[PDB]
Structure 1
Amino acid sequence: EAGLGGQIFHKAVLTLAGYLRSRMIEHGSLPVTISLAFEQNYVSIEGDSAGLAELVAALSAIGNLPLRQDLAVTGAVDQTGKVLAVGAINAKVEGFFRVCKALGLSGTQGVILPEANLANLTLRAEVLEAVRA
């Protein structure tokens, strides 16, 4: 709405609305307004790769469900709620490790990502060591 999101990002939001509307039908129309923001983002963002994170945040806000902040999330979602492949998977993973590392590893941090990207994980040594530990 503020003009920071591209066409593919917009598409991902409409897909997510399609999923949400169609899962929760018992009341008629969804009796809620849901707003989603990337806090402190000041630049244009494009891609559907934040869809799964927007969807979990939306179901959490509806259901009053506390979510783990030690697990970052990445993945695109289709209207049926299936998680889809995203690009730059190794960068994403490693960049959440760097932040967790810079603030002190707690032991329970990690990332949730699409099963369809398993074959693109070629993680750097430091992350594979942490996972092994």
Structure 2
Amino acid sequence: GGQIFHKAVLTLAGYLRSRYIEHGSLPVTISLAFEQNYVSIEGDAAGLAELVAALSAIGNLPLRQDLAVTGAVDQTGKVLAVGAINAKVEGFFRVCKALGLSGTQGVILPEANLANLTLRAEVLEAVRAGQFHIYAVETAEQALEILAGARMEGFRGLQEKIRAGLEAFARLEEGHDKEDRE
């Protein structure tokens, strides 16, 4: 994995280093991984799921596991359309149905894919019955708000939580540096 530098890693790093700014550099190292290897990850595009997972790790935000997150993002945070949205939504529906539906599972998909959303009969019937939900998002902030069940602004918002997580990591770094200096 030497060189290359990818386009997804650069995009996520740019978003994180520009959106959350209190020190001269981002005080965290983010390790992103997929559990089991059948993913066929796209090295040319960042993921909304990757960004929300990194944000949750930074801010200790408990994301809903009910909702699956799909979509590509740029360094601005705008959620871009992704190919084969129907296949992904139907696959998550199949997984939820196999494990049993609880009336709260759903998919967070870009609003740019509403033109591409032609779902199977079973998925549409589940959405009609309220056993499956579909959320359309314009920016990664909206997706993180839906996942964490909290707003990005106001008292005890996700913004201040993530910023406090970065502040704590910076405190750990500065304490380690002070200890090593002396």
Q: TM-score, normalised by structure 1?
A: 0.88
Q: Residue 44 of structure 1 is aligned with which of 25, 40, 45?
A: 40
Q: Secondary structure at the match of 2:97?
A: helix
Matching residue of 2:131: none
C-alpha change, 1:49 and 1:122, in structure 2 (3 Å) is farther
Identity %: 98
SS at match of 2:107: strand
Match of 2:139 in 1: none
1:24 shift after superposition = 1.2
* Number of equivalences: 128
Highest CA radius of gyration, 1 or 2?
2
Q: Is residue 7–residue 46 contact of structure 2 (8 Å, CA) maintained in 1? A: no
The offset of 1:7, in angstroms, is: 11
1:41 deviates by 1.2
Report the 3-state secondary structure (helix = DSSP H, G, I; strand = E; otherwise coil) of the residue aligned with 2:6: helix
Deviations 1:57-94 (Å, cap 9, x if unpaired)? 00000000000001001000011000000000000000
Equivalent in 113, 117, 124 of residue 117 of structure 1: 113
- C-alpha contact (below 8 Å) 2:90/2:123 kept by paired residues: yes
Shift in Å, 1:48: 5.1
Unaligned segments of structure 2, at least 5 residues: 129-182
Structure 1 residues 52 and 122, CA, compared in 2 at 3 Å: closer, same or farther?
Answer: same
Once residues 6 and 42 of structure 1 are traced to their aligned partners in structure 2, the CA distance between those partners, rounded to angstroms, is: 22
Could you say if the C-alpha distance between residues 35 and 73 of structure 1 is closer, same or farther in structure 2, counting changes exceeding 3 Å?
same
* SS in structure 1 of the partner of residue 51 of structure 2: helix
Within the candidate set 39, 55, 60, 1:59 is matched to: 55
- Does the Cα contact within 8 Å between 2:14 and 2:75 map onto a contact in 1? yes
In structure 1, distance between residues paired with 2:62 and 2:127: 25
Deviation at 1:45, TM superposition (A): 2.7
Shift of 1:46: 2.4
Displacement of 1:131 in angstroms is 0.1
CA 1:108 to 1:42, structure 2 compared with 1: closer, same or farther past 3 Å? closer
Alignment check: 8 A CA contact 1:74 1:112 kept? yes
Shift of 1:27: 1.7
1:99 and 1:41 map into 2 onto residues whose CA distance is 17
Structure 1 runs of 4+ off > 4 angstroms?
A: 5-9, 47-50
- Cα deviation, 1:13-63, whole Å, max 9, x if unaligned, reads 210110000011112201111100011115743255661000000000000
Cα separation, 2, equivalents of 1:34 and 1:47: 17
Q: TM-score, normalization: structure 2?
A: 0.65
